[PDB]
UniProtKB/Swiss-Prot annotation, chains A, B:
Pfam families, per database record: MCM (PF00493), MCM_C (PF21100), MCM_lid (PF17855), MCM_N (PF14551), MCM_OB (PF17207)
Stated name of the protein: Minichromosome maintenance protein MCM
Result of changing D389A: Loss of helicase and ATPase activity
Activity regulation annotation text: Inhibited by the cdc6-2 protein. The ATPase activity is not stimulated in the presence of DNA molecules.
The MCM domain, residue ranges: 276-480
PROSITE patterns assigned: MCM_2 (PS50051)
Species whose genome carries this gene: Saccharolobus solfataricus (strain ATCC 35092 / DSM 1617 / JCM 11322 / P2)
MF terms in GO: ATP binding; ATP hydrolysis activity; helicase activity; identical protein binding; single-stranded DNA binding
The gene coding this protein: MCM
Impact upon substituting K331A: Sharp decrease in ATPase activity. Almost devoid of helicase activity
Effect of substituting R316A: Loss of helicase and ATPase activity
Length: 589, 589, 161
DNA sequence: TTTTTTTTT
């Protein structure tokens, strides 16, 4: 038995990272300045430094984590005594455990060991408080004594009350003292296994996890997470007998990750290429041949515009795309790709969705009997992208429920005495088929689309796809067979890098409109409106929304190159893509 | 060792305000005269008077507050000995606490400290009575003795049954004596966080607060309030075990303020401008170009007329506006602005509203099994404005629920054995699209509204918005791009001061109609009757309702200028707006 | 004294007051015990007694614990024949709509009618009641907080319109 | 009762 306090302190103060910058030393300095009370340590770094120390953490976790925490606290306290009286104790969280076990393959032998499970977050409860050291008071005409009930031991998960007063050795009834009671933050969350690991013909399983102290509110529902902790059995109602000697299992989370400097460096050099826009466009759905104009439209929606928030109103900065095409034009294929490359996306279908499920659902809690709100698909997609396949297959009474969310980006509910307004800032991508399955060229556009003009005006771009056999069949057939043969197109940015690029652009880039782009947009909008009045029979209308669309598209093109201003070149591209949308719908320019 | 009783009396008596009038001395004088029993003290005043006094109260409020009550009570006692026999003790309340913490950021370290939280009140409980000192009689044939149970401390939040009789030392049965029991007023309320504070993709949280003594019935649901007090853990079934030693927190209210003398001067001098009405109109929706005539109608609805109450009937004092326009005419943008600038407004949509949610909903308590009502959207909007967007999309079974509210300004509830009639004196602002999306001029208004003719009879003014691409496209395009570029319109009233201006006018201004003014309305209304018979095919009928509506519009104009008298210039202005209403609806004169 | 149904506070309990409101619910006439008669079921006792001795029987129903005659505990059986009853009726009073403040729901108060006061008025009428307020007790034995109590109304005289 | 998805007169 050798003390690990010196080794742990030596590891923190002597470890050299990629640049030999003493990364953990910097983390301590950040911890002291911000009073973060939590430290994150990569497991592979510990193993590289001292393999014996890594072994002890994995197995002897129950009786070595407090030892390291105490040593770390003294080092921080010595570094800055002001840190004391503000933070009582610090936490050491280990990340990178080699022991990873699937949610469905958890057995009895894994209880009591530090393991890692990767899944999808589903439900998060409001933050509550847990008593870990009580303070009772034996009220009895002779006692008038208070005491901390659990002596030399943390309070168990089961609320237990003293039977014999330690101060007088007598029974009676005791009264809790909230003022002297010590509390710790407590949150309950539910994790679900990923859809790619569920066995065939079976519903996904669920596991209950517990977050405490600073770990509360570390993630939102729908996030992909990696949790490391100790499994344990759950006790709910042990007071009443009746067998039920079978218990569920829950998880005590010690460290949690969601979904770096090197990545930012990789992204920065990518935008240096003048043809970065073409590379991004060609990297959208590499398995689909052609449809270049469609690929550009989907790329713009991934980046989006710049939302504007003023003192009196706000203007949305999301781009909505609608695709109408004959069956077999692969429309669902790009939509599936978009839901996989976007940092945050939700995939829905017209037939399998309802008005309540898309925006918000009011459900009665059977435990208390009072109504409460449940987030819909659009609410869960706030700040992301919502995909609605088969938009024409849903009832018009249900489709009309998203008119407010698509423009005002808010959901208003007045039901069961509940008045609320939830943000739904999400970009909507929709696809569907014409009225008669396939497009009828002889018939006009009004009866082919079979959609009200109100929802049509809310879409920035509308593309009509027609499957016309011709001279391009041979090249299309060769491309499809090459995909089935395993051949892949090179010079394509991978999904993981592309997803990182999109997230960085949406966070640190905010283009501004210049004077040159202002004149070009104004001239085109005025000219576009004049031609619209010539033929008023078209279902589509040129409303002031289309003017907003040009600004959003112009910003999206600039954001793709990580530019700071909307130059003249970006304005031309916005006009060019708008011309194709107008030409496809039947309006010449 | 340092006593602050003298400092408290010194601070109350020797404090100089900005007017140098000893406001706190006047507050005590007002308290004694009206038996207020509650004193409001700003924290900033104490900080200027003495830093040590300010630091003590904000930190040690648990013990200093009872001490400060005695010094105030004695000073009031010597000021007026008759204060006794009516009020046993007074209350001192501190406001302006700088310890402001967000609702979602509350942690374990904040329990037991004086903090303040800003939120929205959503639920109020009927006033109840709480026991703080009980009296029991020992039911045992030897005792027949009455004793107060909690000796040397207050009754805790959990009622405790004495087990041993203090007077005789014998256990048995005890009977509560309500005659000698001490009671205190008790109320429960729920606070919800503001929509602007909710994180992306999450749902708003709630916190339960407790109001006691004079703090009961100090607010109504839907009001934004700032509440200060001490947090504590909630106990529901301490006797009943079952593990789950996790407790939710609740707030003990000590001072509550809903949502002022320099602003009074700031609004009175503003009305001195003879062009104040023009400036107010130009300040409505500054981000919307044009629509000058429709902006005037919205301003009138913000102020409204003066209700007339007779010995048998009441005359509605509110103005109802219906807006029908093509998609993309910014109908929803100004409705959002109206809901934000009005002192009390509720925003609802046609698809997100139900009949129960608009008027009242019954809720069955799980415990008692009793039905009780909940406030609907219209009830919460009483005394304010109710905004109903996309009124043409709501189901007719829910549309009939507002027919009584528009005309009778009342809501009748007869369900689940509960019969009541609620007041719904709220102005209704509604918007909707034409029957065929784009308005058709050649067809009449009846086949374009897609609404029953009955509901349109209750609307004072109806406006038609037309999106016709013409020479104004360039001006509109330039204006929109200016908004997106950060450019703002100057010489306009800010929203915060505009809301204060509207609230003052609706409270302290009651214009009176002159005899000469009545001549114009009576003469004008006669000419409408002649034209009604000339063209009886119009869907608009010249009823006595139009005569009543004309009076309200003139009264609103006078209230806009803070004038207590209705001159002739307001009557002609009311005539002009009615004429354009008839011109837009197709009745050309 | 006349007090609005919404302005009732803690200081008004135990004093004669007058409330004006609208009847909304009337319960069927029932009987209440003010002096019960108990028989000790113990193979030696066979004794009859009135448990609420020298005191009116309270609202809470409490059975005797020790036999006043034999001086021993056991089983006590109530005798409906020897007991004395009194007419009992429950009703709910709702405040007038004109008294309701803006944007609030009307309050309700529970009143008790006894003896000849039963069936004095029908639901939907306007009445003015007089009497003494008191708190409501349902299950004082059950612990678990609930230290707050509601207030009901005992009617001594009621007039209609 | 009231909001929701579902099979059923
Ligand atoms: Mg498809
Ligand atoms: Mg709208
Ligand atoms: Zn003891
Ligand atoms: Zn006794
Ligand atoms: Zn006996």
């Amino acid at each position: 038995q050798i003390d690990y306090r010196d080794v742990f302190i030596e590891f923190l103060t002597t470890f050299k990272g990629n640049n030999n910058q003493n990364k953990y030393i910097e983390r301590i300095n950040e911890l002291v300045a911000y009073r973060k009370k939590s430290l994150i340590i990569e497991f592979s770094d510990v193993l590289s430094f001292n393999e014996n120390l890594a072994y002890e953490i994995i197995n002897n976790t129950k009786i070595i984590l407090p030892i390291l925490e105490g040593a770390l606290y003294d080092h921080i306290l010595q570094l800055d005594p002001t840190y004391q009286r503000d933070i009582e104790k610090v936490h050491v969280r280990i990340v990178g455990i080699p022991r990873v076990i699937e949610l469905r393959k958890i057995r009895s032998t894994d209880i009591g060991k530090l393991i890692t499970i990767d899944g999808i977050l589903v439900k998060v409860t409001p933050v509550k408080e847990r008593i870990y050291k009580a303070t009772y008071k034996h009220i009895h005409p002779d006692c008038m004594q208070e005491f901390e009930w659990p002596e030399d031991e943390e309070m168990p998960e089961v609320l237990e009350m003293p039977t014999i007063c330690p101060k007088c050795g007598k029974p009676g009834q005791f009264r809790l003292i909230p003022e002297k009671t010590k509390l710790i933050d407590w949150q309950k969350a539910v994790i679900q296994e990923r859809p790619e690991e569920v066995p065939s013909g079976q519903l996904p399983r669920q596991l209950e996890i517990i977050l405490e102290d600073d770990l509360v509110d570390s993630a939102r529902p729908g996030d992909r997470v990696k949790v490391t902790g100790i499994l344990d059995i759950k006790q709910d109602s042990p007071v009443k007998r009746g067998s039920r000697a079978v218990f569920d299992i829950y998880m005590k989370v010690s460290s949690i990750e969601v979904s770096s400097e090197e990545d930012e460096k990789k992204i920065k050099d990518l935008a240096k290429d003048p043809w970065i826009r073409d590379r991004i466009i060609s990297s959208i759905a590499p398995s689909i041949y052609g449809h270049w104009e469609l690929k550009e439209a989907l790329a713009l929606a991934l980046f989006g515009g710049v939302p504007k928030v003023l003192e009196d109103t706000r203007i949305r900065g999301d781009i909505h795309i609608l695709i109408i095409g004959d069956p077999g034009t692969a429309k669902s294929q790009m939509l599936q790709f978009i839901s996989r490359v976007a940092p945050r996306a939700v995939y829905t279908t017209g037939k399998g969705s309802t008005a309540a499920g898309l925006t918000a659902a009011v459900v009665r809690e059977k435990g208390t009997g009072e109504y409460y709100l449940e987030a819909g698909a659009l609410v869960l997609a706030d700040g992301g992208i919502a995909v609605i396949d088969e938009i024409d297959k849903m009832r018009d009474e249900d489709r009309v429920a998203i008119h407010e969310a698509m423009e005002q980006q808010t959901v208003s509910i007045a039901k069961a005495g509940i008045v609320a307004k939830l943000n739904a800032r999400a970009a909507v991508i929709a696809a569907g088929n014409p009225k008669f399955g396939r497009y009828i060229s002889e018939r006009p556009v009004s009866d082919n689309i079979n959609l009200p003009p109100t929802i049509l005006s809310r879409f920035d771009l509308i593309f009509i796809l027609k499957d016309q056999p011709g001279e391009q069949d041979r090249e299309l057939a060769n491309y499809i067979l090459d995909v089935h043969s395993g051949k892949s197109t090179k010079n394509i940015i991978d999904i993981d890098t592309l997803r990182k690029y999109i997230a960085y652009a949406r966070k640190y880039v905010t283009p501004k409109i210049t004077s040159e782009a202002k004149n070009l947009i104004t001239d085109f909008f005025v000219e576009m409106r004049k031609k619209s009045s010539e033929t008023p029979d078209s279902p589509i209308l040129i409303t002031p929304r289309q003017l907003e669309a040009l600004i959003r598209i112009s910003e999206a093109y600039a954001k793709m190159a990580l530019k700071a201003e909307v130059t003249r070149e970006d304005a031309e591209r916005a006009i060019n893509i708008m011309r194709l949308f107008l030409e496809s719908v039947g309006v010449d320019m």
